[PDB]
Amino acid sequence: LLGIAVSTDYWLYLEEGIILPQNQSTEVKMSLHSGLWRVCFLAGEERGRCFTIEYVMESTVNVLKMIRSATPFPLVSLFFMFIGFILSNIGHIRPHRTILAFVSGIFFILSGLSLVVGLVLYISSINDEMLNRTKDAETY
Amino acid sequence: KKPQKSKPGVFSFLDPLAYEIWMCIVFAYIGVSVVLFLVSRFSPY
Amino acid sequence: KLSEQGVLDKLKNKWWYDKGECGAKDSGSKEKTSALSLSNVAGVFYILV
């Protein structure tokens, strides 16, 4: 599930839009779904850019650059199930000399610890840039 | 720029108590814990 | 002549006061408090983990 999630660039949605006052309700202006490696841009002006973050193109781009600060910890997290499961295969063929299981179970526990660190660095990187927009009443 | 709500620091939870209190808590955390140890030495009952 | 009788001062009262104001009218009742973000309480998790 983490192997599917990292290559997937459908982590988070954004809908940049402008309000409409009365007998008129809403009007979208920009939209993209985001990824940790690279952005695959969406139906904002119908331009299908699977666009790398390291190349440029505002505040929604400032959202996208801060996502890279939470890149390494899921990459740290994916490797620790890679080292956790292969040592689990060793205990199935050769059950004796049982020390390898008790060590590999630590790497299951220490794997998700980086994921909680991974989500804390991720979600706090979303909400501060949610705060960092200048609060204008006309743009929802 | 009109100043907005600032970016919250990573240690923004210990904001409502000043720096000298947080030292005086822990220094009294130790000091009460030391004296509570030395009280129970002299007394069996 | 306009300054000794305050025509220019009234025109100063005219043009900077008629354009709409941004004073206590949006500092008065255009605030509601938000929920806490994660970033307000983020450092507790770093001490925890």
Swiss-Prot record, chain C:
Subunit annotation: Homotetramer or heterotetramer of pore-forming glutamate receptor subunits. Tetramers may be formed by the dimerization of dimers. May interact with MPP4. Forms a ternary complex with GRIP1 and CSPG4. Interacts with ATAD1 in an ATP-dependent manner. ATAD1-catalyzed ATP hydrolysis disrupts binding to ATAD1 and to GRIP1 and leads to AMPAR complex disassembly. Interacts with GRIP2. Interacts with GRIP1. Interacts with NSF via its C-terminus. Interacts with CACNG2, PICK1 and GRIP2. Interacts with GRIA1 and SYNDIG1. Part of a complex containing GRIA2, NSF and NAPA and/or NAPB.
Post-translational modifications reported in the UniProt record: Palmitoylated. Depalmitoylated upon L-glutamate stimulation. Ubiquitinated by RNF167, leading to its degradation.
Expression (tissue specificity): Detected in forebrain. Detected in dendrites of neuronal cells. Expressed in the pyramidal cell layers of CA1 and CA3 and in the granule cell layer of the dentate gyrus.
Subcellular localization(s) per the UniProt record: Cell membrane; Postsynaptic cell membrane; Postsynaptic density membrane
Originating species: Rattus norvegicus (Rat)
Protein name, per record: Glutamate receptor 2
Site description Interaction with the cone snail toxin Con-ikot-ikot, residues in chain: 1
Family: Belongs to the glutamate-gated ion channel (TC 1.A.10.1) family. GRIA2 subfamily.
Domain of life: Eukaryota
Protein purpose: Ionotropic glutamate receptor that functions as a ligand-gated cation channel, gated by L-glutamate and glutamatergic agonists such as alpha-amino-3-hydroxy-5-methyl-4-isoxazolepropionic acid (AMPA), quisqualic acid, and kainic acid. L-glutamate acts as an excitatory neurotransmitter at many synapses in the central nervous system and plays an important role in fast excitatory synaptic transmission.
Record remark on domains: The M4 transmembrane segment mediates tetramerization and is required for cell surface expression.
Induction (free text): Down-regulated in the pyramidal cell layer of CA1 in the hippocampus by global ischemia.
More info: The postsynaptic actions of L-glutamate are mediated by a variety of receptors that are named according to their selective agonists. This receptor binds AMPA (quisqualate) > L-glutamate > kainate.
